[PDB]
Structure formats: structure tokens, C-alpha cells
């Protein structure tokens, strides 16, 4: 199932997922495709922050939904 991930701004990339994919799984797919470490990824859907252990279906994320990717910055 196709979903879109867009940054700000920001190329849109596509992922193939299933609704039962965890947010952790999604971050790993973004790493595979784009090289961004999961620990630097913040994903948002309809203004809601997506938490690692939950699944896409938990957030009612369906075909061709768009997630927003914001990079995380931690101090040293």
C-alpha cells in the first residue's frame, strides 16, 4: 500500500507499507530509502505526532495518506 512522506521542504517520497506496520517500521523504511537515521526522524499525520510502538492503522493512516517528516535535533 502506498503512502507519501513529505518534508518542509522538501521532496515527497513514497513507501510501500501495510496498515499493521509500526511507526518504527516506517522509520526504518525511510532510512533504507533516504539514509536518515530513525532517531533523527519525527513523523506527523494530521497534526498528530506518531509514536514508535503504534501502527499506521492506530492513526487511521490509509492508502495515499501523506505523512510529514521533520528532522530532530538533540544537543551533544
Amino acid at each position: 500500500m502506498q503512502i507519501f512522506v513529505k518534508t518542509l521542504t522538501g521532496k515527497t517520497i513514497t513507501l510501500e507499507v501495510e496498515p499493521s506496520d509500526t511507526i518504527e517500521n516506517v522509520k526504518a523504511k525511510i532510512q533504507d530509502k533516504e539514509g536518515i537515521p530513525p532517531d533523527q526522524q519525527r513523523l506527523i499525520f494530521a497534526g498528530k505526532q506518531l509514536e514508535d510502538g503504534r501502527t499506521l492503522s492506530d492513526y487511521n493512516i490509509q492508502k495515499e495518506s501523506t505523512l510529514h517528516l521533520v528532522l530532530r535535533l538533540r544537543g551533544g
Binding site: 513514497t14 507499507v17 517500521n25 530509502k33 492508502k63
Partner: protein
């Protein structure tokens, strides 16, 4: 020449496991399930999809999920390219492609994009033109279907997308296929680094081994 017509006509798809032949119905995702043997495979590259925790490769970081191992020339990756960049890969290799619809085309009712999809509608499926916006220079197709068309030509001619990769893309592909995070050697300048990565990727990671190719 007839590349566009070949993309637009009804295509076949064969189960890579049991060899059963189907007619492709567009409109679904990249996860295909053979109805005869239940084999799950990618429509872009024919590699297998493994469900969570049943993939064979250590260490596939995407192991805890439904996934396949796609080659760098699978639509799975190439659908993210701009049309302009897909066009450049073709142009760099002297492959012709359409930007305008056939001279003797036919008006699409409602649409929009002319690609026929089996769409979900209330209580079932219905064959219907895609109907999405058709940008100038996209041969009467929408953005996504135009890219699929260009990818069909790229794959037919065994063109290697890595030839256009930036260094970051070479590094990402290297980590993915060779399971190592590359870095410049001491004394190695940025252009020499990029050349080495491209060289290593090309000679070590083949393009899709199950993607059908022009045989002539």
C-alpha cells in the same frame, strides 16, 4: 517508437513462483498475491515479499516488517524521481520517449489521464480511466503514470539509475546493498570518492535480475 502504446495496452504479469500468466489490472498497490499459489511478489521487480519476521537476510533492518529486497531500478525506487530526471537517464542513453499523446488519440470522458484502472467503488470494482490531471509534456498521462511509462523504458533498456546518483545516494545504496556505511579513504578527494562508490556499486550489485529486458 511503440513504447507508449506498449505501456498503455493491457500487459501480462506472470507469477515468478508458479509461472501462471495473468492480465495485469492496474489500480492496486505493489503487493501482488498470486491467486493460484499465494506467492507474494513485487509488481516492479518480481522479487518476493516476506511477511514480518520470515525474511532470509541477516541483517535486513526492515526485517520486522512486510518487505521485499528491491533492486535500484525497481519502480519502488524510481517512482520517487522527477519526470525530468527519468527523462535524463533515457536521454543520456539515446532512448526516445513521448512527451505528447499519439497523433491520432481519443478524447477521455471526464478525465484526465487515459490509463485504465480497476478502481474501488461502492460495492466492488469498476474499470475506469485514471482521470488525474495531465501536465503538458506528459504524453496525456498523469504524473504518476507518466513516470511508470518512463520506468518501463528504463527497465526495457537495462539503464542504470546509479549513473545519475549524487554522492549521498551512492552512500545510501551502498549501505543498503553492501551492508556497509562507506566513507572517504584518507587522501581521497570528493570526486574520487564518488567515482569509487559508483564503480563498486556497479560491479557488485546487479540491476534487477527478474526485471524483463529487451533481448536483441
Amino acid at each position: 517508437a511503440q513504447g507508449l502504446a506498449m505501456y498503455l495496452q493491457e500487459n501480462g504479469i506472470d507469477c515468478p513462483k508458479c509461472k501462471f500468466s495473468y492480465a495485469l489490472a492496474r489500480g492496486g498497490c505493489m503487493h501482488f498475491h498470486c491467486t493460484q499459489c499465494r506467492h507474494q511478489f513485487c509488481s516492479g521487480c518480481y522479487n518476493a515479499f516476506y511477511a514480518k519476521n520470515k525474511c532470509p537476510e541477516p541483517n535486513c533492518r526492515v526485517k520486522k516488517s512486510l518487505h521485499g529486497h528491491h533492486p535500484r531500478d525497481c519502480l519502488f525506487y524510481l517512482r520517487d524521481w522527477t519526470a525530468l530526471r527519468l527523462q535524463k537517464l533515457l536521454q543520456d542513453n539515446n532512448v526516445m520517449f513521448n512527451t505528447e499523446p499519439p497523433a491520432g488519440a481519443r478524447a477521455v470522458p471526464g478525465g484526465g489521464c487515459r490509463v485504465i484502472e480497476q478502481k474501488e467503488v461502492p460495492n466492488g470494482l469498476r474499470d475506469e480511466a485514471c482521470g488525474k490531471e495531465t501536465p503538458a509534456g506528459y504524453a496525456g498521462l498523469c504524473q504518476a503514470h507518466y513516470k511508470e511509462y518512463l520506468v518501463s523504458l528504463i527497465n526495457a533498456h537495462s539503464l542504470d539509475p546509479a549513473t545519475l546518483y549524487e554522492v549521498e545516494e551512492l552512500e545510501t545504496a551502498t549501505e543498503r546493498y553492501l551492508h556497509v556505511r562507506p566513507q572517504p579513504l584518507a587522501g581521497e578527494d570528493p570526486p574520487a570518492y564518488q567515482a569509487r562508490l559508483l564503480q563498486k556499486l556497479t560491479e557488485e550489485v546487479p540491476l534487477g535480475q527478474s526485471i524483463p529486458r529487451r533481448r536483441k
